[PDB]
């Protein structure tokens, strides 16, 4: 009864401070493109989402410098509306203990963005905690329905190191490093650093040819098997393991070069990682918006019309493809002999 009043208080002006300065996106234009394709949350939901981005960005206590609406996770009892942000002042991250692989701090790699979440649009936003690589790997072993409560337990076996807030945060890390992508040629990657730079000599591609996965490129760093966007090779005194020597895809790698899904029964051709999605039935329709659609993470979509491109996730959080099996127990330790 109070959440409806908050979501209506998103609209208009508050009746009788100073607002915060931030940089959002054209969330109404994002809703226009995704309504053009047929994916996303619908056009009235994206307007309330734009006003929730407005409320999160104007709050002076939060101190946000940039907001992007990540998307929506479906849970059993409540949903999750997820907003990705950068803050004006990063929180303190505790140092990881000895023996474990270290953490990517705030503003670097998998913790480059602070994720806020609510259960309704305009409701109370709770900052999700930072993510660790052990949570990413333990989330890779899991396949769970979310419940909508940020304090529910996840699983006993496999041992996940947190509650549902940490599991949602690991899902956001995995989906963000794999499905948020930019049109090809819109950015250029530095050959020294890892940061991007928007080039000025880019031409938009006309209409339906932005439904080709050769025309998109991952704008975020690839999330390795270790649980880090940049693998951590420990200091040696034929030594390093396979997880440390994983030099993955190059920056701004296209969606044509993603690994296909494992082959399902009935067809020996592996399904592609990305499918086209079209706005119009006819090829000859003027001013078409087009985009690609993720098959590994179903619910993740991308869209482009001119210089205006979106990427958005609306899903259950489930990785698909049939490459999940229930986890076996750890092998019981052999004795001292061990032939």
């Amino acid at each position: 009864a109070a959440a409806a009043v908050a979501k209506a208080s998103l609209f208009g002006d508050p009746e009788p401070d100073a607002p915060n300065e931030f940089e959002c996106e054209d969330v109404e234009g994002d809703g226009d493109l995704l309504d053009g394709l047929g994916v996303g949350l619908g056009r009235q939901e994206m307007y309330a989402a734009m006003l929730a981005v407005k409320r999160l960005g104007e709050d002076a206590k939060r101190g946000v410098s940039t907001v992007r609406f990540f998307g929506k996770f479906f849970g059993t009892q409540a949903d999750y509306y997820v907003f990705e942000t950068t803050l004006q002042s990063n929180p303190d991250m505790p140092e990881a203990p000895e023996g474990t692989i270290p953490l990517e701090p705030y503003g670097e790699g998998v913790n480059a963005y602070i994720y806020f979440v609510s259960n309704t649009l305009g409701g109370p936003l709770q900052q999700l905690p930072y993510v660790t690589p052990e949570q990413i790997k333990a989330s890779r072993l899991l396949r769970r329905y979310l419940t909508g409560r940020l304090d529910a337990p996840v699983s006993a076996f496999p041992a996940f190191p947190g509650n549902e807030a940490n599991y949602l945060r690991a899902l956001i890390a995995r989906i963000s490093a794999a499905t948020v992508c930019c049109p090809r040629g819109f950015f250029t990657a530095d050959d020294d650093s890892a940061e991007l730079s928007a080039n000025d000599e880019w031409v938009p591609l006309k209409g339906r040819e932005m439904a080709l996965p050769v025309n998109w490129s991952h704008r975020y760093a690839h999330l390795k098997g270790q649980g880090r966007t940049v693998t951590h090779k420990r200091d040696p005194p034929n030594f390093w393991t396979a997880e440390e020597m994983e030099a993955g895809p190059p920056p701004l790698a296209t969606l044509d070069t993603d690994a296909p899904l494992p082959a399902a029964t009935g067809d020996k051709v592996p399904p592609p990682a990305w499918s086209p999605v079209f706005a119009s039935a006819s090829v000859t329709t003027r001013n078409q918006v087009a985009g690609v659609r993720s098959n590994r993470w179903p619910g993740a979509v991308c869209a482009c019309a001119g210089r205006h491109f979106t990427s958005m996730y609306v899903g259950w959080g489930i990785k698909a493809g049939g490459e999940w099996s229930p986890c076996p127990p750890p092998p019981p330790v052999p004795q001292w002999g061990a032939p």
Binding site: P153, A156, F157, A159, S325, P328, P329, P330, P332, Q335
Partner: protein
């Protein structure tokens, strides 16, 4: 009480007519292993504690210089086995308790591998049935799951891929 040193191993215990008969604390000075326990005819027999070079600690029964009978082994990763031994391996009825995942395996063992019984998790969810044994890595083969959060049981088996194949729908049940 003939404390005999070796060119170096250090025995400290009683000897009856040259050989070890009684309690004695033999120490391997090459590998670091020690044994404090009983002796028959210069060999390990009866009971005694054995610590190994990989810091595994055995406390239990001995028949002729090999782990037999009932015992308690403690592994270098903190895993604890309690139950029947044969031929120096896990064989019979036993309980293997992990340290990390805190789950445990209770039931029939065969040649160091778990071949039948229950595998209960931390929260009370279990898989009961026939496991892979020593040929596999004690992987589950055929039986039924109970998950306690959903309170659902399902009978099925595992395919060669490793994926669960249930013979029917899940159903509301108890913890077997």
């Amino acid at each position: 009480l003939g404390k005999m040193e070796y060119p170096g191993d250090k025995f400290e215990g009683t000897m009856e007519h040259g050989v070890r008969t009684g309690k004695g604390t033999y120490t391997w000075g090459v590998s670091g292993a020690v044994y404090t326990g009983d002796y028959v005819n210069g060999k390990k027999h009866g009971k005694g504690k054995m610590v190994y070079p990989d810091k595994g600690v055995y406390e239990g029964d001995w028949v002729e210089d090999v782990m037999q009978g009932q015992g308690t082994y403690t592994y270098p990763n903190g895993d604890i086995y309690q139950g029947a031994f044969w031929a120096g391996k896990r064989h019979g009825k036993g309980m293997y308790h992990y340290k990390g995942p805190c789950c445990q395996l209770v039931g029939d063992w065969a040649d160091g591998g778990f071949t039948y019984g229950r595998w209960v998790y931390a929260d009370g969810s279990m898989f009961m049935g026939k496991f892979g044994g020593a040929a596999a890595d004690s992987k589950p083969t055929a039986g039924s799951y109970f998950y306690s959060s959903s309170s659902l049981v399902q009978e099925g088996h595992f395919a060669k891929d490793g994926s669960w194949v249930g013979h029917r729908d899940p159903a509301v049940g108890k913890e077997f």
